[PDB]
Design a protein around this ligand. Structure first.
Ligand SMILES: O=C(NCC1CC1)N1CCN(C(=O)c2cccs2)CC1
Length: 119
């Protein structure tokens, strides 16, 4: 029922994601020189360094907000891909599965802890 525990749990999961070869394309904001149409296609670019910095700045209130930004990384890849068989897109789907598998307990514990706090 620790309502603060999500933050270190998210730091640890981000560390695992950064160790994962599949995160390579998503570690930093898209190179708009190599992809000059990218900002035509994608409204809000997001990457894992921006998520980590936002967390470490104390600018997430909840793991739901972090989860929304990580999901935006994956939806941006899905929107920008020219093919469902693209290398970068395919890396996004495996990394998304990994992230969802690990964030579910972080979300559940947080929401349980806040329900207990408000009981
Ligand atoms: O340039 C980068 N990222 C490099 C940065 C240093 C990490 N990316 C290109 C656009 N992206 C896509 O999702 C797709 C491309 C092809 C099909 S989808 C991911 C981000």
């Amino acid at each position: 029922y620790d309502i603060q525990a999500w933050k270190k749990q998210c730091e640890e999961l981000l560390n695992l994601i950064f160790q994962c070869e599949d995160s390579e394309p998503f570690r930093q904001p898209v190179d708009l020189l190599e992809y000059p149409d990218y900002r035509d296609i994608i409204d809000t670019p997001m990457d894992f360094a921006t998520v980590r910095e936002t967390l470490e700045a104390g600018n997430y209130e909840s793991p739901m907000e972090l989860c929304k930004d990580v999901r935006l990384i994956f939806s941006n890849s899905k929107a920008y891909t020219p093919s469902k068989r693209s290398r970068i897109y395919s890396m996004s789907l495996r990394l998304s599965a990994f992230f969802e598998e690990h964030i579910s307990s972080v979300l559940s514990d947080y929401k349980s802890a806040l329900r207990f706090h408000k009981r």
